[PDB]
Amino acid sequence: NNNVEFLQNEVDLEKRLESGENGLNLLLNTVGRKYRCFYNNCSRTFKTKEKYEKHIDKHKVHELKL
DNA sequence: GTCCGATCAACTGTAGTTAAGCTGGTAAGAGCCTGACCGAGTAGTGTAGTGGGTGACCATACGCGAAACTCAGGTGCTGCAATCT
Numbered sequence: 284n285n286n287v288e289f290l291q292n293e294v295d296l297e298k299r300l301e302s303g304e305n306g307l308n309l310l311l312n313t314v315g316r317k318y319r320c321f322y323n324n325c326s327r328t329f330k331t332k333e334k335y336e337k338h339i340d341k342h343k344v345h346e347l348k349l
Numbered sequence: 350g351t352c353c354g355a356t357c358a359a360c361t362g363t364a365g366t367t368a369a370g371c372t373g374g375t376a377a378g379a380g381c382c383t384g385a386c387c388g389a390g391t392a393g394t395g396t397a398g399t400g401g402g403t404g405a406c407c408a409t410a411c412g413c414g415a416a417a418c419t420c421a422g423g424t425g426c427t428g429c430a431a432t433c434t
C-alpha cells in the first residue's frame with residue numbers, strides 16, 4: 284500500500300548498489316560488522332564504511348604530516 | 350492511528366584493565382568400555398472351545414428276478430350205452 288515509499292526504497296537501493304556498495308556490505312552492516320582501524324596503536328571502530336574510510340584517510344593525512 | 354518532543358542510552362571524541370603461556374610436577378574436568386539390573390519388547394506359546402467334514406453303518410426305495418400258491422388245464426381208462434352188423 285505504501286507505493287511511493289516502496290518506490291523510494293527500491294530506487295534508493297539501486298542508487299546505493301551503484302554507489303560502490305557490493306550489496307554484501309548492506310547485509311554485513313545488519314549482521315553486526317563494525318569496521319576497525321589497522322594502523323599501529325589505533326583500534327577505533329565504525330558502524331558504516333564511509334566513517335571507516337574517513338578514519339583511514341586521517342591516517343594517510345598523519346603519514347603526510349610525518 | 351498519529352502527533353509533539355522529552356529523554357535512556359545509541360554511537361560518538363580518548364584513558365587505563367583483561368588473557369595466553371612460560372619451568373614444573375600435579376589433581377582437576379570430561380571421559381571410555383566391560384560389566385551388572387531391572388523394565389519393557391518381540392512374539393510364539395498354552396490350554397480350551399466351536400465348528401465342519403470324513404467315515405461307517407443303516408434302511409429305504411425301485412426294479413429284476415426267484416420261488417410261492419391258486420385255480421383250472423390235461424391225461425387215460427372204462428361204465429354204460431348205441432351204431433353197425
Ligand SMILES: [Zn+2]
Pocket residue numbers: 320321322325326327338342
Ligand atoms: Zn586508526
